[PDB]
Amino acid sequence: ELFRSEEMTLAQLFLQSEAAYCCVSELEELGKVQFRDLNPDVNVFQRKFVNEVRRCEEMDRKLRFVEKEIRKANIPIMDTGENPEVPFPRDMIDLEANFEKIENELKEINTNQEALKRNFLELTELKFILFVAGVINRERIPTFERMLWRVCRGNVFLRQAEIENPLEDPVTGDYVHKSVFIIFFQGDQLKNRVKKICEGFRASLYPCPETPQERKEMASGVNTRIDDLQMVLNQTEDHRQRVLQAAAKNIRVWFIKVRKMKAIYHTLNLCNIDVTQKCLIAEVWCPVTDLDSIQFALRRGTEHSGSTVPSILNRMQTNQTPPTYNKTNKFTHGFQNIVDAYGIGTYREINPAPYTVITFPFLFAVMFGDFGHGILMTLFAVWMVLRESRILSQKNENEMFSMVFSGRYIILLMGLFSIYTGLIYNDCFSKSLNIFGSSWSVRPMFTIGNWTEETLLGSSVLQLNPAIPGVFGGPYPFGIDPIWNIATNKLTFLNSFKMKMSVILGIIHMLFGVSLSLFNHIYFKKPLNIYFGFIPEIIFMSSLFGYLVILIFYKWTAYDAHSSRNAPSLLIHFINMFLFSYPESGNAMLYSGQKGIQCFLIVVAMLCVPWMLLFKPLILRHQYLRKKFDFGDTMVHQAIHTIEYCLGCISNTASYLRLWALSLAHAQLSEVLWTMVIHIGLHVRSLAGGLGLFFIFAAFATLTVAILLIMEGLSAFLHALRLHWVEFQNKFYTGTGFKFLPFSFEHIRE
Amino acid sequence: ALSDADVQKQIKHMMAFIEQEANEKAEEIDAKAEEEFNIEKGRLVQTQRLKIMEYY
Known part of the structure; x- marks a missing residue:
């Protein structure tokens, strides 16, 4: 029993x-059905x-403005x-406009407030x-005064005025004491001149001072109007604040x-409009598993509505290639995605993900x-898991963190197995x-x-520890004996292991991948794919590559x-x-009679090729003439399969040398x-050693990371993932499908 | 989980839906016909009845 895609059924609702x-509305929230567009030209x-x-x-x-x-x-x-x-009431249409009115009010408030600010900016x-x-x-003011002097120099007296603790300047919104040297003229031509000069300069000449106390009375009156203005601004601001908090709540x-009503509308557009009835009928694909759930959902939806239309799903048999649906959860979803990254599997294809989780x-x-x-x-x-709730309930604009977070459960296992293998490799930094x-x-x-005082000559030599001296031997209980980590020839002992191990593991995974194809060919009742395919294919691979693996273990013992x-x-x-x-x-020779075995296996492997190469197209041609089939094209397809399979087996087995190359490099x-x-x-000096190690270690940790x-x-x-993509999956995980995109309430975090 | 007979029942339902609308529409049409009947008749009878009286 293997995990496969789920059934969906196309119906007309x-x-x-x-x-x-x-x-x-209800089905969209339920989320188990996907509608097609029946009128693409519309x-x-x-x-x-x-x-x-x-x-x-x-x-x-x-809404965005507000x-x-x-x-x-x-x-x-x-x-x-x-x-x-x-909610999905029609009344919302008018209520949304009321929402706009609220926002329209803020613009008006801002409009008045800025206008008010300018008068304030002026009145001060x-x-x-x-x-x-x-x-x-x-x-x-340096150049203000000098430039005015030169308009007619010394012609009028300089008026000096200063403002301490000023308000913010209206143009720059900046508070800064004023120290101004002004030229004022009685003559009209020169007053006009200085007006032009002083106005070209960033200067405010708003008032027209007069000796008569009437002007002072006027200013007193304005001061009153200004205080009233401030009180009005305070009122306008209070309303502004009340309305804005109200808007945040709404x-x-x-x-x-x-967002939801719009989505609903989108789907409603995603429909076929009937002519005989004011009813819409659509082709909808929903999982058989959820068929009862959906019928109950239809009942609830239509029951709320006053028309009590039966709202029945009309089940129909559609050739239309169904989407590929794989049910995932919080843990397995990430693993499914790294599979989907390569492609969507064929409908009812064997899902590799349940085995990827460990493999x-x-x-x-x-x-x-x-x-x-x-x-x-x-x-x-x-860390990521412990903060899972905090990472989800926040914004994460950094796509690099999002990626590793999404794969956080994949990484968790990566570490746990890396620990296991590191212990057997017996290497920790x-x-x-x-x-x-x-x-x-x-x-x-x-x-x-017979090594007496060898440490005298040893002063210039190493000397390799002999095998079978009668006093050495015995395996290390778990992993590689620690002694090799201090050897000068680890570079042959340990490298030999990793090369041979990589081949052993790669081939076994390849054989597994082929084995899976048997279940798929049986599921789809393709006898030819096992009588002319699987059997000679698995023999081909076993006879050549499994034989090698056996010999590797044989020599060791x-x-x-x-x-x-x-x-x-x-x-x-x-x-x-x-x-x-x-x-x-x-x-x-490894054993007596090996020559006969070597010849036998190669001959059989070659004899396996005709089976996979020509028997399927030939028998299909026979079935055509017996029953009464593009014979030429079929031969091409089968020949390509055979050629790529056999040549790929050779290349794929070598490909797993990635395991060695990366392990060695690390x-x-x-x-x-x-x-x-x-x-x-480290150093023989105590305190200096400690202080140096402090800084050096930090650099070390930095480089290690x-x-x-x-x-x-x-x-x-990536390389381990590639092995799945290239060598493993290509033995059974073939073809393409469509991504299953049911109605769903996806925009929850937004 | 539900039979093809209940789908058939749903068809019968929509047919009933149609018959109800059919009935409502016909009634609306006949009622307006009677209104137009009476309106034109009244106009005509008033016009001629008045002229006859005026002549007398």
Whole structure:
């Protein structure tokens, strides 16, 4: 029993108009059906939602304007209520206009307030007023005065006026004391001249001072009018504030109300309008699983409506390729997406995701098998999960964080498996984990084995620890014996393991991927795809590549150091196998009779090709003539499948050398990054060592994250994913489908 | 979970819907016909009845 896409059924739903408003509303909130556009040549005008959409757009523009003003006011609007009400009354149309009136009022308030500000901005000058001296921002009084002097120099006396603790200048909204040197003239030509000069300068010459106390009385009167003005501004501001808070309360509700009604209208346009009845009928695909749920939903929707139209889903058999629906949850959704990133699977295709959940983290952990970094990676995922509620309930404009957050459950596993593999690799920042179980060799016995004072010559040499000395041996309980982490030849011991392991794991996954194809071919009742396909295909792959894997394990248990000289070479026998090369001498054989086996397997693998190459098109041609089929094109399709399969098997097996290449590179970077960075932070001087290690460590941690935790994890992330895309999935996960997009209330966080 | 007979019932329902509208529309049409009948008749009878009286 494998996970596959869900069934959907195409039906024609006949909904009376009044009932239709209720039904679309309810079903859209329910979210399990998807409607098709039945009249692609028909526009929204044609669908008759043009008034509905235009109305929504007007309301939207008004709402956005108000929203902006609300934000400007720093109003703490929550928009956390109203979620389940989904109103859809027709009366909303008029109420939305009333909402606009509210917003229209704010513009009027702002309009009056700015106008009021200008008078205020102006009136304050009279108080400072109470020859005509002006008020300046004093930024250029130097040149104001000198430039006026030169108009006719020394012609009139300089009037000096100053304002302390001023109001904000109206043009710049800046408060700044005024210190102004003014020229005022009695003559008309020169007064006109200075008027022009002083006005060209940024100066205010508003008042016309007079000796008579009448002008003072006037200023006193203005001062009174100014205070009244301020009181009016205070009133206008109070209303402004009251209205804006009221709008924030209404606007959070209306965002949803309007957004939803519009969406409903969109769907209503997404319909076929019947002619005989004032009823709309649509083709709708909904999951069979949810069929009862939807019928009950139809009942509830139409029951609210006064027309009590049956609102029945009319089930029909449609060839129309259904969408591919895979049910996911908070955990598995991310894994489905990395599959969908490559493509949408064929309807009722075997879903690779249930196996990806483990398979992918495993292959990653092989590439990134690092104990220390696995911890760091795990903790990061833990952070995101612990803050999951806070990260969701906020804005996240940074797409880089959003991506890793979306995959946070994928990363969690990535870390957990990376820990497992790192422990077996026994590398934590180039350090092994010695549990006092390392019994690889007994150095005391090394000296017994005819090594007397070798540490004298050792001063210039290393000396390799012999195998089968009679005193060494025994496997490490778990992982690689820690001793190899301090060896100069780890570069052969450990590299050999990773190469051979990568091949073993890759081939097994390939065989699994092929095995899955059997379930799919049976499900679709394609006997030919198993009698001429699967069987010779799995034999082809097994006979060549599984044989290799067996021999790898065979040597490990078949040959000891006793035969290390002229020990059989697995690669050479593998190559000679394919080529039928059987030299009399020069290479030791793994076992007696191997030659016969080598020849047999290759011949069979080649004999497997005709099955997959020609038997399907040939039998189909026979069935054509017997029953009474593009024979030529069918041969092309099958030949391409055969050619790509066989050649890809060879390339795909090698492809999994990605596991080795990445695992090797990581270990090499870790060893060098450790040795050339943090080791340098250590020194025989006590305090200096500690203080230096402080700063050096910080740099070390920086490089470990920058180079290994991010980048190498990033490369291994992609490369492991590619292995699924290229070598694994292409054995069974074939064809394309459509993404399932049912009616859904998606805009919840917005 | 629901039979093809209930779909048929829904069809019968919409037919009933149609018959109700059919009835309402015909009634509306006949009522206006009677109104136009009476209006034209009254106009004509008043016109001629008055002329006859005037002659006498």
